[PDB]
Amino acid sequence: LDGPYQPTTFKPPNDYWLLISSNTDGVVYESTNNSDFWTAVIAVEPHVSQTNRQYVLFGENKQFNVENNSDKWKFFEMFKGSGQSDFSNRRTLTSNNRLVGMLKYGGRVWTFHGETPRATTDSSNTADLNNISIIIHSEFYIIPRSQESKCNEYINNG
Ligand SMILES: CC(=O)N[C@H]1[C@H](O[C@H]2[C@@H](O)[C@@H](CO)O[C@@H](O[C@H]3[C@H](O)[C@@H](O)[C@H](O)O[C@@H]3CO)[C@@H]2O)O[C@H](CO)[C@@H](O[C@@H]2O[C@@H](C)[C@@H](O)[C@@H](O)[C@@H]2O)[C@@H]1O[C@@H]1O[C@H](CO)[C@H](O)[C@H](O)[C@H]1O[C@@H]1O[C@@H](C)[C@@H](O)[C@@H](O)[C@@H]1O
């Protein structure tokens, strides 16, 4: 498969999964169109009891109270729907394969959430899908929709 690509600011094409390989706690990527969609994935290592941590999302430092009592890495999707609106934990992937996925498709962003090995795809709407840029902080792989079954096997089995 195609990569790794090195961390960078990326404008992702339609009909391609970004398989993103997180190597450490912190921001995994920051995704926005600056209109109706912000999404940042915070990674939290196993056995973190509720505590406050500082993260730098979209050029501003921000504190989140995070906990992971599981023996599995947790990837918290932090969504907001306008620039002047506050962040929410919309979805959680719990996985020791430490891969997230992102796909621009059919005027929606699809991602993996739930627990491996039965993590599943879910969509989020946007009215400006094409102007979604993304700062990715780890090595990533590009998979075509043509090979979408492979993206699935990797999220859930590594
Ligand atoms: C039923 C389900 O899929 N629950 C998920 C939940 O999904 C919600 C999200 O997709 C949000 C995103 O904004 O949308 C919700 O639907 C809205 C809808 O969009 C509105 O239009 C509508 O009017 O209202 C509905 C509300 O009904 C979806 O319900 O996402 C959470 C967050 O990721 C997920 O919980 C996580 O994953 C589980 C495994 C566990 O680790 C949790 O702690 C995580 O936070 C929900 O999954 C279920 O979680 C349950 C307990 O909270 C059980 O654990 C259950 O086993 C989980 O379900 C399994 O995993 C799911 C990912 C999915 O694959 C299910 O088919 C499967 O049974």
The label of the residue with tokens 């946007």 reads 126
Whole-angstrom Cα distance, residue 43 to residue 95?
Answer: 10
Distance 4 CA to ligand 1 centre (A): 30
Resolution as reported, in Å: 2.5
* Residue with CA closest to ligand 1 atom 60: 114
Index of the ligand 1 atom closest to the CA of residue 122: 10
CA of 2 to the centre of ligand 1 (A): 31
Q: How many CB atoms lie within 10 A of CB 147?
A: 13
Q: Which of 122, 126, 155, 156 to mutate to test the pocket of ligand 1 (most atoms within 8 A of CB)?
A: 122
Strands 60-68 and 26-32: unpaired
**Cα 91 to ligand 1 centre (Å):** 8
Q: From ligand 1's centre to the CA of 112, what distance in Å? A: 11
Q: How far apart are CA 2 and CA 8, in angstroms?
A: 16
Q: What residue ranges do the domains of the chain occupy?
A: 1-158
Resolved by: X-ray
User: Which residues contact ligand 1 via a Cβ below 6 A?
Assistant: 90-92, 94, 113-115, 120, 122
- Tell me, in angstroms, the distance from the centre of ligand 1 to residue 22's CA: 23
